Amino acid sequence: MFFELEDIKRRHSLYWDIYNVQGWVRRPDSTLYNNVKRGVTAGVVASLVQENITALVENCKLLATKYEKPQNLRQAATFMKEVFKLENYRKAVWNRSQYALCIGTFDIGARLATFRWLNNGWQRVFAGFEFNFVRKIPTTMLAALFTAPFSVPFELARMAYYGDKTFPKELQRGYSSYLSALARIPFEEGPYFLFKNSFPLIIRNFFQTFTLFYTYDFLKDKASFAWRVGEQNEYACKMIIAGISTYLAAVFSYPWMVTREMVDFWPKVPGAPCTFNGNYRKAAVWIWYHEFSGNYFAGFFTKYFWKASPGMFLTLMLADKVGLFDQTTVDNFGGAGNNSWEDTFV
């Protein structure tokens, strides 16, 4: 009627089942405003700590490259004090703090909001462990894919901002700050300048968000026997599960990010065609099929782990605290649990 395809609306009759629970019921708190608010709050807080840690570590490396590393506790204390008062450190903290606000609000918040939207209604089994977690896999996969490319425009803007500072005055844009660079790049180089050859970031974000949210949600319920039967410390178990979740996220995410080094940084054989033709996707496929894992796992900690994992770990803890991973559990033999009360005691 309105166009070539017609969305036919149809009515149906009443249908009900013996049990009204353990299926999909949308929680009242699962709303666009509430989910977005919680996701943004958790992401911003996690991002601020992550970027502050990254700035501190890199400033320490910068200072150590010109001065001997600490020899004892006293030397370590003065070394940290000098790093804190470094002029470069203060500027880095300010700029990266802005980067954290943008990333935590548009990328981590979007991931959490989408995850809550697609996975709030999966009820768990009363007095038991949630089975049929396979049903949640499509939801988490859908959320991960949908929110995967929400960080590339900011990350490329960050790289462009920092890469501009190192050019001569004639060739320097002169960005006032990260926010100014982000607001100017779209109108100067064009929107596609913030998305060209974004495969390494997109796949990295997908493998980070999917295996972090899903593994934590799965582990937080399946491993609950530790503090439900073993009387172990619930918070300690959750911290351990979060630690496992972030470590796996880093392991599954770093190899795809190594494509940047192989394609661009590895020296090129004179006269021979590029091993990967300058295509990151082909390099990722090569990494996927490579026999030796250690070859592309090198530099995992010195390059990527401490820049991403601390942020992911905090995000899970913050998300759990606010209640993004909280599911509804009700007795299936209760009043609302089932529609057949004649066999709940007989």
Ligand X SMILES: CCCCCCCCCCCCCCCCCC(=O)OC[C@H](COP(=O)(O)OCCN)OC(=O)CCCCCCCCCCCCCCCCC
Ligand Y SMILES: CCCCCCCCCCCCCCCCCC(=O)OC[C@H](COP(=O)([O-])OCC(O)COP(=O)([O-])OC[C@@H](COC(=O)CCCCCCCCCCCCCCCCC)OC(=O)CCCCCCCCCCCCCCCCC)OC(=O)CCCCCCCCCCCCCCCCC
Reading the block at residue 203, the tokens are 């796949």
CA distance between the termini of the chain: 57
Of 77 and 84, nearer to another protein (C-beta) is 84
Among 84, 131, 235, 297, binds another protein (CB under 8 A): 131
Task: Report yes or no: 324 and 29 within 8 Å, Cβ to Cβ.
Answer: no
252 touches ligand Y (CB under 6 A): no
Number of H helices, E strands in the chain: 14, 0
Task: Report yes or no: 332 and 71 within 8 Å, Cβ to Cβ.
Answer: no
Look up residue 293 and give its amino acid: S
Stretch of 43-51, 192-200, 238-246, 295-303 contacting another protein, by CB under 8 A: 295-303
293 C-beta neighbours (distance < 10 Å), count: 10
Q: Under 8 Å CB-to-CB from 342, ≥6 apart: which residues?
A: none
Q: Tell me the site size for ligand Y, rule CB under 6 A.
A: 40
236 touches ligand X (CB under 6 A): yes
281 touches ligand Y (CB under 6 A): yes
239 touches ligand X (CB under 6 A): no
18-37 positions binding ligand X, by CB under 6 A: 19, 22-23
297 touches ligand Y (CB under 6 A): yes
CB neighbour class for 267 (10 Å; exposed up to 12, middle 13-18, buried from 19): exposed
148 touches ligand Y (CB under 6 A): yes
CA distance 330 to 333: 9
Contact partner at residue 206 from ligand Y, ligand X, another protein, none, CB < 5 to 8 Å by partner kind: ligand Y
Contact partner at residue 203 from ligand Y, ligand X, another protein, none, CB < 5 to 8 Å by partner kind: ligand Y
313 touches ligand Y (CB under 6 A): yes
Among 237, 242, 249, 324, binds ligand X (CB under 6 A): 237
CA distance 251 to 253: 6
Least separation in angstroms between residue 194's CB and ligand Y is: 7
Among 232, 279, 327, 328, binds ligand X (CB under 6 A): 232
Residue 326 sits at the vertex; the CA angle it makes with 325 and 330, to the nearest 5 degrees, is: 145
Of 4 and 87, nearer to another protein (C-beta) is 87
Q: Which residues are at the interface with ligand X (CB under 6 A)?
A: 19, 22-23, 132, 134-135, 138, 225-226, 229-230, 232, 236-237, 240
